[PDB]
């Protein structure tokens with residue numbers, strides 16, 4: 001509880017030697033208290049690239065682009081998705097850069113941020129979100145989102161189950177004012193986000209240790225949603241402005257991600273944000289030993305079929321054998337300490 005006492009978003013510039021073992025570097029950033037913010041930025045070494053170029057992708061199909069209709073006022077919004085017809089990246093980029101949807105002119109990011117919160121209910125944009133794929137070359141051995149080699153691999157290993165976007169990669173083609181609503185990951189997992197190219201993506205984050213304060217507040221503002229689902233934030237429809245969070249005393253931080261940067265999110269780290277203009281991001285979830293307890297305790301959406309539920313059985317039997325029978329008989333009373341680094345970080349703590 002002494003590392004990163006302010007729970008602020010940290011940034012890391014590893015060398016190529018530090019960069020190589022993905023799981024070990026996550027254990028390192030946690031030894032530095034990065035997980036306390038819920039969100040960390042890792043800027044990869046200059047010589048690292050995941051792809052020779054992106055010249056060849058115009059013909060790539062976005063099967064289900066989503067028009068984002070936002071309704072609300074005074075810092076509180078609900079985002080509704082309108083599924084559009086499939087389109088090629090070529091088609092998507094022409095719409096993104098057209099006068100009707102392009103990024104407005106601005107000086108500071110604080111200026112663009114005001115325009116985002118002022119305008120998010122007007123001129124609904126299109127997000128090429130949740131596209132099954134990867135833009136990593138097959139030989140890329142470091143921080144390859146298609147194969148991170150974390151203990152999350154036990155899901156597919158033990159059961160054969162693949163969960164799209166969770167243990168497989170997703171691409172996201174943004175335009176100006178496209179959004180991701182406030183959410184934690186499925187099963188309160190970690191996630192990795194790489195911005196392959198284009199305009200920036202801005203992020204807000206609430207520290208895991210304060211996640212419950214955010215839920216209590218969301219539940220107050222959206223009482224119908226709360227009555228009808230145990231975890232409605234997981235619908236990823238709820239936008240809440242940082243001025244509202246400030247007004248109700250929720251600690252949050254912000255950060256802008258540029259092309260070529262990774263963002264890590266941590267178990268129970270609520271995050272939200274928006275794209276600045278035409279870009280492309282890739283992400284997936286992953287786990288460390290610390291996640292197992294979060295997985296066991298995650299409150300899952302109780303109202304949608306096709307919602308992600310992972311069996312924790314394999315993880316408890318393997319990594320917590322002494323609590324297995326207790327947990328099974330429904331008696332495992334463990335309280336999560338959000339400040340604690342993952343066991344794998346021992347190495348870096350003397």
Ligand SMILES: O=C(O)c1ccnc(C(=O)O)c1
Pocket residue numbers: 129172179180183184185191193201271281
């Ligand atoms: O679309 C995004 O940018 C984004 C960012 C962070 N997280 C998610 C998610 O679906 O968890 C989506």
Ligand code: NI
Pocket residue numbers: 183184185191265271
């Ligand atoms: Ni996310």
Ligand SMILES: [Zn+2]
Pocket residue numbers: 229230231232235301302303304
């Ligand atoms: Zn639900």
